Amino acid sequence: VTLAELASDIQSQVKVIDTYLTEHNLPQPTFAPDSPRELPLDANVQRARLLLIEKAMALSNLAIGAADNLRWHCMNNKFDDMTLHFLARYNIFDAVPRDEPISYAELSKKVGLAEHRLRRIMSMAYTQHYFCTPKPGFVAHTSNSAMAIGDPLALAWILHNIEEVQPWYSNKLVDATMKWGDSIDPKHTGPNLNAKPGEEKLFYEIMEEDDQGEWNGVKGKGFRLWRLYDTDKFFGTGGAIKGTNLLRAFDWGGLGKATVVDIGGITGHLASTVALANPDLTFIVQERNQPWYEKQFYEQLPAELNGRVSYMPHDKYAEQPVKGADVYFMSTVLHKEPDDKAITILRRCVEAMDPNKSRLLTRDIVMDGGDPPAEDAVINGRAINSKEGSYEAGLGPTGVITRLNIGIDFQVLAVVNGFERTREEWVTLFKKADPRFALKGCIQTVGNCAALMEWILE
Amino acid sequence: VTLAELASDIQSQVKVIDTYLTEHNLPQPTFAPDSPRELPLDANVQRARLLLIEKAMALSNLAIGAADNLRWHCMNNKFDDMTLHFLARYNIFDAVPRDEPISYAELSKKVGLAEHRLRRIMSMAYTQHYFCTPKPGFVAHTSNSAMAIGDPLALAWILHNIEEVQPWYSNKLVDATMKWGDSIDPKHTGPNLNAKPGEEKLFYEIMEEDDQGEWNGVKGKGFRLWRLYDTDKFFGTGGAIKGTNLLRAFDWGGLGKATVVDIGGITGHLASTVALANPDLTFIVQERNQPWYEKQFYEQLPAELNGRVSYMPHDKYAEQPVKGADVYFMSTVLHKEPDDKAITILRRCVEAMDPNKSRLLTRDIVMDGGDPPAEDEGSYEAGLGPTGVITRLNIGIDFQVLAVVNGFERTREEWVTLFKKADPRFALKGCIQTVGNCAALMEWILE
Ligand SMILES: C=C[C@@H]1C[C@H](C)C[C@H](C)[C@H]1c1c(O)cc[nH]c1=O
Ligand SMILES: C=C[C@@H]1C[C@H](C)C[C@H](C)[C@H]1c1c(O)cc[nH]c1=O
Structure with missing residues (x-):
């Protein structure tokens, strides 16, 4: 690929997005703090977006060239992290007003970081579009930095x-x-x-x-x-794996009056999201207890839920105490469990399941990709705006969603030596737990890196 | 700025580069291992290149969006470093043939990394265009990874x-x-x-x-x-701060028969680069001695130099033993020296200089930018400004010296002020920064 070929491809992707935003009278993304934080969830917009990022990263990479890439990388990469370290530890997101600039001198006094060093920290942030300097000696937020205000x-x-x-x-x-x-x-x-x-x-x-x-x-x-x-909640509130995408990958409303058992549901923020949108569902959030857990669990759950979401202490490897529930739900749990531990958990679930009334639902990364929500399946446009070679947009060796998947794969590798799985590895693992298991659905919304998989016992 | 504005700007910059390469029949940069590792040094090509990178980075950032930027950065960024950590420690650059694919199974045996983890490591490298997979189960080099073969x-x-x-x-x-x-x-x-x-x-x-x-x-x-x-040499052999860019920022051949005193010259690779191109120059490399230095100094020194580059042990803060030399040269030395320590070194140089026959030359970052060689949109020159790509490299080096020795980079006015505190006779006669380079060659004289 050449510079001009990539630049030409980029224009194709922008046309799709730019047209959709204009034809729907939707605001354009910018770097201003008032910018929209996401593009529309329309599958064609998202497929173009994912390819646009991939092509744009390739364009910058190719223009930097082979000589400077490794050289520049080892110098600068680690300091984008350190810059965010300073901004977090010094509470600078909150100290910079969202909609008005502040001088370095005033910002220096507010956070207790000497002005000379403060200027150096901010200047690095500017290059990755975190904050900007609208006039000499002044700091203002960008969209990328404003999202962290008060969060x-x-x-x-x-x-x-x-x-x-x-x-x-x-x-x-x-x-x-x-x-x-x-x-x-x-x-x-x-x-x-x-x-x-x-x-x-x-x-x-x-x-x-x-x-x-x-x-x-x-x-x-x-x-x-x-x-x-808190970081688990952070990925639920917005972005690629936001909790509301669960509502698009499974017919929760179709369950009617039903009970969902949330095995390993952290603090129940995901259960709270689905239950708020589905008034006929009960959620039992099962998680290992902590000295501060119960008080924090009940301070943060929305009162309008009227107790429909409750906490039950439980060891995920022990016998499942809730029998015959409509759904047994595990979100990003099994990617931290090697085969033998996962089979133990899955067999605990099977014992409690009614094979004619119970579903097993997991949200996990499918490394080679899930399926789009049916209405997005047929490609109605040009291949250049939805497909990278033989791979779905966002996938392939340089796919942006591939990159996020590997990043999460590396994250569980680093802390607990976990690993992500392909769709066939998931099916193989569930069938080892019980040969009756069958994958009825593997739904991954475009722009999302995790898939909602529905398993039944045949 | 919007997505469409950035994409339109990108087309403008690519047009400059694409036209120049075609009109001069020069190969296009690609990700293939045989790709050119750099674009032409033509100033207009380099200015387009630098803006292109800046525009492309803004485009990817804007398309990722505010919700996903911070979420993705803290997840993936640190693992681009770790991937290179694995590739280096397992010697994988050398184990993958430059012009031939290799299977994961064969590569695993060659480097002693189990195939399953090897595949995970390589797959992350692919996303930043380090190596590729041309067919299932096979690894091949890219341009970005091939540069490290045998290096x-x-x-x-x-x-x-x-x-x-x-x-x-x-x-x-x-x-x-x-x-x-x-x-x-x-x-x-x-x-x-x-x-x-x-x-x-x-x-x-x-x-x-x-x-x-x-x-x-x-x-x-x-x-x-x-x-x-070794890493100091690494930045001399190629890229932004390549040693040969010195030859473009100062008239070395105009010195005639002359002796350069290289204060803090590491192992002399920079002196060796200038001396190979200028047979009439002598270089005295002054550096703190080490048990392994002298044997390593002369083994790596090109024999074609015939001793024109020599090593003299010296404390940069001590009296300069070479009097009246034509040039006293310090490359990226003073940005690790606070004002009082730097003034000490400069005054050591002033004592030994003949104000009518000696020059003092420094290569250092000028944070607000130097001037281009003779021959060579907003308020900033291409590569500079708050999101400039050379600005980014400047800050990265600024942070590098900040981390290790609490150093700092300077603007041009800070440099002039520092030299005049050392000696009021100092005058900046030239501050030359080649386009695409982050360091400037500054020529000081005593008036
Ligand atoms: C805190 C939750 C993060 C969320 C992201 C999406 C995935 C990541 C593996 C996850 C995480 C763990 O589950 C466990 C330990 N360390 C982590 O970082
Ligand atoms: C080793 C040489 C590197 C080269 C890059 C260009 C500049 C960087 C400040 C420099 C460096 C030191 O001078 C000293 C300690 N650690 C370093 O990294």
Whole structure:
């Protein structure tokens, strides 16, 4: 591919998006804080968007050239993370007013970062379109920075990656690989590289047991796990894997009066999303208890739910105490479970299921991709705006959704030696748990990286 | 700005590059291993290139949207670094044939990385155009990965940042700032967060004293400093700060028969580049000695130089032993020196200079930009401005010296002020920055 070929492809993708926004009288995305944070969910818009990102990243890569890419990368990449580290730890998103500029001098006093160093930090952020300088000596928000205003969940995601995953796990993953090999054992991780055998600590042990800190209303024991739960909510409120996309990948309203068992449902934010939109559903959120869990669980659930979402302490490997429920639901649980642990969980579910009335629903990454929601299946436009070679838009070796999938694949690899699966690996795994399992649906909305898979016992 | 405006701007810049390459019958850049690794040095091509990168990065950012940018960045960014970490530590660049595919199974046996994890590593590399998969189960090089074949300097740059700068310094820079403030003391850095007052360790002390390792022909003491020296060479051999760009920013041949004193010249690769192109110049490389330095210095020195490049041990803060030389040369030295330390070095140079026969030349970042060589839209020159690609590289180096030694980059006015404090006779006669380069060649004289 050449520079001109990529630039020509990019124009094709923009025409699709630009036309849709104009024909529907929808605001254009910009870098202003008032910009829309997402493009429309229309499948053709999203397919064009995903290819546009892929082509645009390739264009910048090709124009930088082979000589400068590795050179520039090792110099700059790590400092985009450190810039977000400064912005989070110094609470700079909240200190910069959303709709009006602020001078470096005033911002320096508000956050307690010396002005000279503050200017250097902000200048790096500008290059990735986080904040801008509208006039000399002044800082203003952009769309990318304004989304984090007043949102501790965004700050949780910054700090969890830069202060935990990266220094403790991903930076030591090479050493972990040469010491233990290609492992699926959560003990074979960074923090245990120099641990005496028997004294290893697991990632989730550190999360729930460390008490030397505080986070967003939780003081002492488990503050890291509470921050981890905040980052789980962060991916539910917006973006690729937003919770409301669940409503588009399964006919929740078709269940009528029904009970859903949310195995491993964190704090129930996902259950809360589906239940608010479906007044006839009951959700039992099953999760391991924590000293702060029950008080926080009930402070944050919307009161209009009238107790339809409730918390039941439960060990996911133990016998399922709710028998014959309409749906047993696991969201991004099994991608942290090797085959033998996942088969244990799936067999616990099968025991409680009525094969003629119960469904098993999982949201997980399907590495080779799920299917679009039926109405989006037929490609009504040009292939250049919906297909990269033989792969669906967003997939393939340089696909943007492929990239996000691998990023999550690496995330569970780093912390617990988990892994993502293909569709055939999922079907094989469920059939090992019980040969009666059959995949009736594998729905992945365009722009989403996770698929909602509905399993039944035939 | 909107998606359509950026895409239209991109077409304008690509047109410049596409036309120049066609009208001069030059090969197009691609991702194939045989691709040209750089675009032509023509200033207009480079200006279009720099704006093109800036416009393309804005386009991908805008298309990702505000909701997904922060969510995706903190998920994937750090794993682009880790992927290169695996590729370097497992020697995968060299194990994949340049012009031939290799299967995952065969590559796994060659590098000792189980095939399943190898596939996961390679798949992430693909998304940033490092390697590709031309057929199921097979790996091939791209242009971005082929540049590192047989090049230990490339691997040194990967390992220096991910195994040293990032875990020891940049990761801890927030903590460093809250413990010591906006400091300029090289002791007030990451590794010393829990050090007792007085027993702090300096970055270059760790570099030259650690012996628990080995790198590229150096075993034991100083292996990290030798690896650091390799990464300094790495930026000379190609790309933005390539050594040959010096030949375009100063009339070296105009010096005639002359001697250059290279203060802080690492291993002399920069001197070797200028001296090979100018047979009438002598270079004295002045640098702090190391047990492995002298043997390594002369083995890597091109024999064609006939000793015109020589090593003289010297403390940059001490009296300059070479009097009245034609040029006193410091490349990316002073950006690691606070004002008072830098003034000390400059005054050492002034003492040895003949004001009527000596020049002082520095290569350093000019944060607001230098001027282009003779021959060569908003308020900023291409590559500069708050989202400029060269601005980004400048800040990255600014952050690099900030992390390791609490250094900082300067604007042109800050440079002039600093030299005049050292000696009021100093005058900036030239501040030449080739387009596509981030460093400027500054020529100082004593009036
Ligand atoms: C906190 C939730 C994040 C959400 C993203 C989507 C995926 C990621 C594996 C997940 C996560 C864990 O599940 C567990 C540990 N560390 C994590 O980062
Ligand atoms: C090793 C040389 C690199 C080259 C790049 C161009 C500039 C960077 C500040 C430099 C560097 C040092 O000078 C010193 C310590 N650590 C570094 O990374």
